[PDB]
Symmetry: C3
Subunit: 131 residues, 3 copies
């Protein structure tokens, strides 16, 4: 699967320029309140491209995709609130992690953290480019 | 993917006789107790149909499908207990959202809330039609009585 | 999709010598501390084989670790929601379990909290194998 990632600032641009899931960065440092849900914005828009398939309903196409937590989230108190995000074919907005902080204390996330990852429905290796 | 949905009452049939995720309705008002897991019955049974694929094991078929939370559940204190529901190919039971209330007060869900959605393993667009039975079995809602 | 599983002990092998999800066993009795997350080792390694596709004849493939429906009736939740096991991976399979309760939680050998699933949702078969490949982490090769 092929991703077109529009980075939304220059600082993020330099993150991405500088295997069935594609990691995303935590873009700005942030304190997560205790016992909370926080919509962390990821500083990108994306589209996923695949070959057309024939499907039961009653060239390359625009496809839907998935935001999975990274295994390593399990070592933090943070959980993805909506379990696995579903990002529809038509979505053109910023890509956001819904993160629950399950701890009684605040949690500091920092630019450079990869908590989350993009994945294809079919689990096929991922490729991307900027746009 | 194409779903065939059996509505378990006229009320639910009305809701449905009126996208990569097909949203499902909360079908009865209900209170979830604080700090609880509640099995919320969604008033439907369903069969998913896809084109026959060739697969490594060593036309139009029944297929497995997925039950996902909605994005917007994020804003509530409710979480899907089993992360993502896996519904096997010939499952004929009622569809159920196992919902954790993570908060310490009650949570009132309401007829027409949409917490949860059905999704194909391929992430392809979903259709559905309403049907009276899934098969001839009493669990499919079919056959004699 | 077809799985080859290496059982890391004879005990584990006996349980596996004795449908779109393949249930995996709790392999040893364990107490999980209250309000914690525990990396529970499942005593197996696995590889998944499917038909080569074409993206944008038989291939080694990535796969999914799902909670079982019945996990819902316990206080135990999957930390990472759904675990993604990459095609390359040769380590022991681990379930990261959040004990959401105030009390210790006892899991027993032969409990089944978690299951393996295909990215396609297709029916799963499996066999037991002594190695995944020739590497040491794959448990194969000289030694
Ligand atoms: O994990 C995901 C899942 C979906 N999406 C998508 C494509 C979806 O339509 C869209 C859903 N917007 C919200 C939102 C909507 C309704 C109510 C509350 C929040 C959202 C919810 C959860 C996670 C991410 C985003 C949202 C809107 C505005 C500000 C914050 C959050 O983003 C993500 O970007 N990440
Ligand atoms: O999210 C899901 C996932 C699966 N299913 C399916 C197809 C699955 O085999 C089957 C599993 N029924 C139970 C259950 C089984 C064993 C132990 C405890 C509960 C269930 C569990 C979690 C969520 C929903 C349903 C269930 C059965 C009877 C009464 C309540 C709950 O339903 C759902 O309907 N929704
Ligand atoms: O649910 C899953 C998901 C992935 N994996 C795989 C394939 C992955 O690369 C790899 C990730 N190991 C850890 C880990 C990774 C990074 C940082 C800290 C821990 C992990 C994380 C979540 C769940 C299970 C395992 C891990 C390694 C050693 C000891 C404990 C935890 O295991 C699982 O076995 N189960």
């Amino acid at each position: 699967m092929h991703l077109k990632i529009v980075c939304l600032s220059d600082e993020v641009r330099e993150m991405y320029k500088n295997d069935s899931g594609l990691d995303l960065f935590i873009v700005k440092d942030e304190v997560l309140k205790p016992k909370s849900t926080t919509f962390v914005k990821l500083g990108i828009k994306a589209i996923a491209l695949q070959y057309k398939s024939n499907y039961y309903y009653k060239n390359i196409v625009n496809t839907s995709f998935l935001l999975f937590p990274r295994s390593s989230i399990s070592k933090t108190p943070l959980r993805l609130a909506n379990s696995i995000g579903l990002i529809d074919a038509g979505y053109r907005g910023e890509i956001i992690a819904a993160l629950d902080n399950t701890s009684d204390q605040e949690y500091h996330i920092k630019k450079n953290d990869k908590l989350v990852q993009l994945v294809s429905f079919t689990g096929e290796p991922l490729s991307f480019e900027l746009v």
